[PDB]
Design a protein around this nucleic acid. Structure first.
Ligand SMILES: [Mg+2]
Ligand SMILES: [Mg+2]
Ligand SMILES: [Mg+2]
Ligand SMILES: [Mg+2]
Ligand SMILES: [Mg+2]
Ligand SMILES: [Mg+2]
Ligand SMILES: [Mg+2]
Ligand SMILES: [Mg+2]
Ligand SMILES: [Mg+2]
Ligand SMILES: [Mg+2]
Ligand SMILES: [Mg+2]
Ligand SMILES: [Mg+2]
Ligand SMILES: [Mg+2]
Ligand SMILES: [Mg+2]
Ligand SMILES: [Mg+2]
Ligand SMILES: [Mg+2]
Ligand SMILES: [Mg+2]
Ligand SMILES: [Mg+2]
Ligand SMILES: [Mg+2]
Ligand SMILES: [Mg+2]
Ligand SMILES: [Mg+2]
Ligand SMILES: [Mg+2]
Ligand SMILES: [Mg+2]
Ligand SMILES: [Mg+2]
Ligand SMILES: [Mg+2]
Ligand SMILES: [Mg+2]
Ligand SMILES: [Mg+2]
Ligand SMILES: [Mg+2]
Ligand SMILES: [Mg+2]
Lengths: 58, 129, 99, 25, 108, 142
RNA sequence: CCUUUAACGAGGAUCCAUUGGAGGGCAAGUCUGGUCGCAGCAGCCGCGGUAAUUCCAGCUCCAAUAGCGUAUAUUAAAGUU
RNA sequence: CGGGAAACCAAAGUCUUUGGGUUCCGGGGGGAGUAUGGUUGCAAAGCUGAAACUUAAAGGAAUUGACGGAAGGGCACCACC
RNA sequence: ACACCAUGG
């Protein structure tokens, strides 16, 4: 703590800036739904017991 | 007091069926009780019945089969007019394949299945299934 | 919640019963709530009977008794251990304890 | 007994306030 | 004060201590009097009294009694309010008095 | 334990239901007229006002923070309310003596969360929203 | 304006889809940096006191989609009239 | 018998298989049986009786612990005699 | 046939 601990915008005013790394255009409309169908009903590799959440970092 | 005679006739029949009794006595007798019992017996929910005759209102002895599941009364005699009948037999009856609603029409005391067959409404008395 | 069917009192089909005074407490407890006990003891003693049955100028003299009817508080009787606690299922036994 | 003592204190305060309101009026 | 409280972080005392001075929008103060609800009356060592609040970090971990030196962080928008950030012990208070930090109106 | 079933009791049933509806809390609150009077909004969803000065509402015991509310005076009534400025460093966008548009907090009459005595939030600072200033999509006009 | 029609008019880097969220209710990450009961979040329960699944961001993922969020009135849920 | 959250109840039973007749009365916890108007009384007071505001629980029955300046039976020179 | 026995970072 250094000076007026009740100051506003403290944490958002000392966060390191990061530029967005983006490039590839995301698909839209029917094309996204077609991709989501493939990615879970026909692109599959099954196992007993294991957990397979779509964003699992573990 | 006994405001309603049919109500307690049917509740005393139904309290004994839950108990396995082969017979009941119900008193006083009445014209509407005998007609309701005849309607309930024509279908096969009760056996024969005998009327004991004092010089007063009288008493009835009913032979109970084990087929009766529940019989009961609708407390004010509402008017029912052949279009309310479907909404009535969707509250009182347990299925669409069995169980009857008894109503008094200007052509006698009968069931709903005969009321629609003769195109008549009337007043609801009770039901049995 | 309701610990006793009789509310811990013998009253049934009455509005009121006359109070009485707890014999050591001087409390004010209803007659059919209080804890009663009728004691009948020898006037002289149980040990000192010989010193008196020998000094008596009468050959066959029967010593009198001393009858007292005691009425007790609930608290005051629990404190003198006239009564105790019981199990939830044993409170329903209302027979006088075996002699 | 906080219940009946609350009752008595409120009764006292209300009697006082009513008597004052009537006197000054 | 003794208790069965062997639990909790057991012992946070040492013979070593290092000073901390003022910063931007941060003053010293002297506790004027104690209030309830964790609040406090204070007095900045120059001007206003600036009623203070003992922040979530200090609650029941470092006690503040009346008439002691403290370091409070002022609020920009409000003026009469502040939050007690740090407490100064007797030796450190006299040290600040030596370094000329606090205008010597209040003593230890 | 008893209700009149008889055939000519429509008046008794209707009158008893009408009499007893006045014990439902929300029914009475909506049909009496005292809440529409005591409501600092005139029964409206939003309201414009002028900022008197910013304040530091301290949150309730199990939490610790200083919630940074503002004190507004409403144009149409003249009433003084307290409103909340929700985001990281959004209190810098609100000077004094500038008209702000506030809305409700989301419970229709009550304090939300750990904040005591506050029932509204600020949604517009000066014809520009606090969510365009928070993302840089806009900026204050001076 | 639409419709009918010429003549031009696409390689995906632009002829570039958003609005909300990722502890539970409730579909989706114990991934990486920053802050350290502060800033803030949070309809409710609850997150933050130096190893944050909830704050600020980056990446990834979920929902509806040319729409999505918020405040209020009201209906169903309410067999809590 | 059957009912009920259970304690318990031959009634607190004959209830999603819900309808014998009828009067009174309740709608989360506070503010509060308060303020105010009316009425009664010699007085004390009785009857009728809100709202703004505030809050995420207040509460019921039973279970397992811990505690008791509660009772019964035992025990230890880290207890006494 | 019952002296005193208050409070808790
Ligand atoms: Mg008890
Ligand atoms: Mg009495
Ligand atoms: Mg009431
Ligand atoms: Mg309320
Ligand atoms: Mg047009
Ligand atoms: Mg996004
Ligand atoms: Mg978010
Ligand atoms: Mg995130
Ligand atoms: Mg969620
Ligand atoms: Mg989930
Ligand atoms: Mg960290
Ligand atoms: Mg982290
Ligand atoms: Mg509704
Ligand atoms: Mg409601
Ligand atoms: Mg009864
Ligand atoms: Mg009955
Ligand atoms: Mg209530
Ligand atoms: Mg009343
Ligand atoms: Mg009055
Ligand atoms: Mg809470
Ligand atoms: Mg209990
Ligand atoms: Mg227990
Ligand atoms: Mg013992
Ligand atoms: Mg020994
Ligand atoms: Mg010794
Ligand atoms: Mg002690
Ligand atoms: Mg004390
Ligand atoms: Mg105390
Ligand atoms: Mg304590």
């Amino acid at each position: 703590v250094h000076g007026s601990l009740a100051r506003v915008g403290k944490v958002r005013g000392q966060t390191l800036k990061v530029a967005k790394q983006e490039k590839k255009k995301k698909r839209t409309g029917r094309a996204k739904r077609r991709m989501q169908y493939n990615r879970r009903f026909v692109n599959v590799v099954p196992t007993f017991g294991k957990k397979k959440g779509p964003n699992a970092n573990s | 007091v006994r405001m309603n005679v049919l109500a307690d006739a049917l509740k005393s029949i139904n309290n004994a069926e839950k108990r396995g009794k082969r017979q009941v006595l119900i008193r006083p007798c009445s014209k509407v009780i005998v007609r309701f019992l005849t309607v309930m017996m024509k279908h096969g929910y009760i056996g024969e019945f005998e009327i004991i005759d004092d010089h007063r209102a009288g008493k009835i002895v009913v032979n109970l089969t084990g087929r009766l599941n529940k019989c009961g009364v609708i407390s004010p005699r509402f008017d029912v007019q052949l279009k309310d009948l479907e909404k009535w037999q969707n509250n009182l009856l347990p299925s669409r394949q069995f169980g009857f609603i008894v109503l008094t029409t200007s052509a006698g005391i009968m069931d709903h299945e005969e009321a629609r067959r003769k195109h008549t409404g009337g007043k609801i008395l009770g039901f049995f299934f | 919640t309701k610990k006793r069917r009789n509310n811990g009192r013998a009253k049934k089909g009455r509005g009121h019963v006359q109070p009485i005074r707890c014999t050591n407490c001087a409390c004010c407890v209803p007659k059919d709530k209080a804890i009663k006990k009728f004691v009948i003891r020898n006037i002289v003693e149980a040990a000192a009977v010989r010193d008196i049955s020998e000094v008596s100028v009468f050959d066959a003299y029967v010593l009198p008794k001393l009858y007292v009817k005691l009425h007790y508080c609930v608290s005051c009787a629990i404190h003198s251990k006239v009564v105790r606690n019981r199990s939830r299922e044993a409170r329903k036994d209302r027979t006088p304890p075996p002699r | 007994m906080r219940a009946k003592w609350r009752k008595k204190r409120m009764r006292r305060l209300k009697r006082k306030r009513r008597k004052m309101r009537q006197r000054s009026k | 004060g003794g208790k069965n409280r062997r639990r909790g972080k057991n012992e946070n005392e040492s013979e070593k201590r290092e000073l901390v001075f003022k910063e931007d929008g941060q003053e010293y103060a002297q506790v004027i009097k104690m209030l309830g609800n964790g609040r406090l009356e204070a007095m900045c060592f120059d001007g206003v009294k600036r009623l203070c609040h003992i922040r979530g970090k200090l609650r029941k971990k470092v006690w503040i009694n009346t008439s002691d030196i403290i370091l409070v962080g002022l609020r920009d928008y409000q003026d009469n309010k502040a939050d007690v950030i740090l407490k100064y012990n007797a030796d450190e208070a006299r040290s600040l008095k030596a370094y000329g930090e606090l205008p010597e109106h209040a003593k230890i | 334990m008893g209700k009149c079933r008889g055939l000519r009791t429509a008046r008794k049933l209707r009158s008893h239901r009408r009499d007893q509806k006045w014990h439902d809390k929300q029914y009475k609150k909506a049909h009496l007229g005292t809440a529409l009077k005591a409501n600092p909004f005139g029964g409206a969803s939003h309201a414009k006002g002028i900022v008197l000065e910013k304040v530091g509402v301290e949150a309730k015991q199990p939490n610790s923070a200083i919630r940074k509310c503002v004190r507004v005076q409403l144009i149409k009534n003249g009433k003084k309310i307290t409103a909340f400025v929700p985001n990281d460093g959004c209190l810098n966008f609100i000077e004094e003596n500038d008209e702000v548009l506030v809305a409700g907090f989301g419970r229709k009459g009550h304090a939300v969360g750990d904040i005591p005595g506050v029932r509204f939030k600020v949604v517009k600072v000066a014809n520009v929203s606090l969510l365009a200033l928070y993302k840089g999509k806009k900026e204050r006009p001076r």
